[PDB]
Design a protein around this nucleic acid. Structure first.
Lengths: 162, 168
DNA sequence: AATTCCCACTTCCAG
DNA sequence: CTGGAAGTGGGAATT
């Protein structure tokens, strides 16, 4: 089902992260930076996940400080999401130890979950936030959804052996 | 069931519009612009005003289809820039298309004027042209019109019934 | 979502 | 067996 309450949103994020997390440590630090996925790496993909997660936190930073949010990101438009994926790859290009990469994804995920707990259910799925899209729906678009999508491309990859 | 003739199509439109319009008129203008409703697309919140905008967008789109046909120009289905799996994305366009209409009475007039043009248009087609042969893919012209006039009218009545149970 | 896409989940021969 | 085409069936589509 599509998440439609605060409780549902949290549980989707936890579950999709769990499974994706398990598939991610299943990769060795050596394979993770090779190009196996117009082809990228697990490292590239996890940076894409951190870029989006960081960005969602950034939106709420901006919002908290009374500042107008620039969606999706400054210098980008919603039809350019692959170009925003290029920026994310580079943003974390110099994190060369897989172990730190996964640790940074995991703590980002934790912050997002903490951010959601901070809002009421009306704040997440009752009111409109970005045009008609609710705050919770927006958060799911760029967290729980790409977790699933990412874990997909992963289990396909593990089917390369041997 | 589904209208099968020019006569049925025109009556189902006038009925479902008359019904829907009764519920729409029994909603305060102040309330009608409040965001309250889960929208056509999951994870959105919309007003009763957006609900009407959705109908106006679909009806004018239907008139636009025919305007294209009347000039001998190729129709783009469902609309320029949207594939058929992007109807959620189109509903949003329809909200924005009419959001500068801030007076509820003007907006229901726009829906009323739109519905009159739609039946006036059905009036100029024979039954054969409406239900006699396919017009787009396998559907008949009448089906395509009913599916975006009569049906969404009734659908909007449904949501208004459910909301009428609470009145704050 | 009329359709469209994208998964997960099969068959079922080729190997 | 055994990937792995290739075809199905259900659910979501979004920003």
């Amino acid at each position: 089902a599509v998440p439609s309450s605060k409780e549902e949103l949290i549980k989707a994020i936890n579950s999709n992260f769990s499974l994706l997390n398990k598939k991610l440590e299943s990769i060795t630090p050596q394979l993770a930076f090779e190009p196996l996925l117009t082809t990228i790496s697990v490292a590239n993909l996890v940076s894409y996940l951190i870029g989006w997660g960081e960005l969602v936190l950034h939106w709420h930073d901006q919002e908290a400080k009374g500042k107008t949010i620039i969606f999706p990101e400054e210098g980008f438009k919603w039809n350019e999401l692959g170009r925003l994926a290029q920026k994310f790859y580079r943003d974390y290009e110099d994190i060369t130890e897989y172990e730190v990469l996964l640790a940074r994804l995991k703590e980002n995920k934790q912050q997002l979950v903490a951010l959601i707990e901070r809002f009421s259910n009306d704040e997440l799925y009752g009111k409109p936030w970005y045009n008609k899209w609710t705050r919770g729906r927006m958060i799911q678009f760029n967290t729980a959804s790409p977790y699933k999508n990412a874990s997909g491309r992963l289990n396909k990859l593990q089917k390369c052996l041997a």
